[PDB]
Amino acid sequence: MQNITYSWFVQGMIKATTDAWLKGWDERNGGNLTLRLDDADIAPYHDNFHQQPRYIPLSQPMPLLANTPFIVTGSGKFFRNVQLDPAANLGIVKVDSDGAGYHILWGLTNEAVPTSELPAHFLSHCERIKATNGKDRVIMHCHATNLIALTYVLENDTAVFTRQLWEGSTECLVVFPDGVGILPWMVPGTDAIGQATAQEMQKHSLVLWPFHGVFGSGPTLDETFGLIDTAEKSAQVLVKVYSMGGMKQTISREELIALGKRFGVTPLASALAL
């Protein structure tokens, strides 16, 4: 069989992390990415797996993810280095029969282990799975520059932040009509911040971590990266506007509503109501 590093998902992971690194969203080891795969995706590469896969317990039972394989970025790993050493920076893990832990089937060579925001990722995956009926398969976290900067000047309010981002680029309301969830600052790499994020994932495909980064969910690598890139693009436009003195004009609520009606999507009411 073909080498697993040449698979669609491994190549996709390389592409997403590499593009993110070039965007300037992932300095050092900042950010992480997890993709939910199907048994059939990895079945072809059984001969590539470690002969004695490492098992690592899971922070809290996640029955819904039992026997579910994921390709993930490693803890403390650089998005910049993914492209040339995939196995060292990426790993394929599989939650066991009862979601108690997982085995590292491939990659994460040299005692490496999955990302430290993993308990956060799995929790959000579970919620996005129910919220989107199994359609969302990607959870991506990165340090989107402008989005971060905005968390220091905009009221950390979901409705307020969502509305500004919708205003920052015409298609934002269409790309993320459910809005963006904003959590209060919280210590990272914790079951706690993972819980809260997962809770926001029930209501939004996008979640902001003030003074830190963004969390996005989507059906595919491109759609997810695209989701984040759209919000960051709006944020980038907003940063320039604010820096110039603020909005002289912008998209009106009636207009935002008309936009929603046209693309047959229903905008977060609270944000829409401003």
Q: Which of the residues are catalytic?
A: 117
Q: Are 224 and 150 in contact (CB under 8 A)?
A: no
Alpha helices in the chain (DSSP H): 8-23, 39-42, 79-82, 86-89, 118-131, 145-150, 158-167, 172-175, 191-203, 221-243, 253-262, 269-272
Nearer to a second copy, 85 or 178 (CB): 85
Question: Is residue 218 a contact point for Zn ion (CB under 5 A)?
Answer: no
What does 241 interact with, of Zn ion, a second copy, none (CB < 5 to 8 A by kind)?
a second copy
Residues 8 and 187: their CA atoms lie apart, in Å, by 35
Amino acid type, 62:
M
Q: Is 121 marked as a binding-site residue?
A: no
Among 114, 213, 216, 260, binds Zn ion (CB under 5 A): 213
Please report how close the Cβ of residue 79 comes to a second copy at its closest, in angstroms: 11
Residues 14-33 that bind Zn ion (CB under 5 A): 30
Total chain residues near Zn ion (CB under 5 A): 2
57: partner contacted, choices a second copy, Zn ion, none (Cβ within 5-8 A by kind): none
Non-local CB neighbours of 9 within 8 Å, separated by 6+ positions:
35, 37, 41, 71
What residues contact residue 268 under an 8 Å CB cut-off, 6+ apart? 158, 159, 162, 177, 178, 179
Instruction: Pick between residue 126 and residue 172 the one whose CB is nearest to Zn ion.
Output: 172
219 binds, among Zn ion, a second copy, none (CB under 5 to 8 A by kind): none
CB of 194 to a second copy, least distance (A): 13
50 in a known ligand binding site: no
Structure tokens at 149: 């900067």
Residue 210's binding partner among a second copy, Zn ion, none (Cβ under 5 to 8 angstroms by kind) is a second copy
Q: Are 179 and 271 in contact (CB under 8 A)?
A: yes
CB of 91 to a second copy, least distance (A): 15
On whether the CB atoms of residues 91 and 54 are closer than 8 A, the answer is no
Binding residues for Zn ion, per CB under 5 A? Answer: 30, 213
Residues placed in the known binding site for Zn(2+): 141, 143, 212
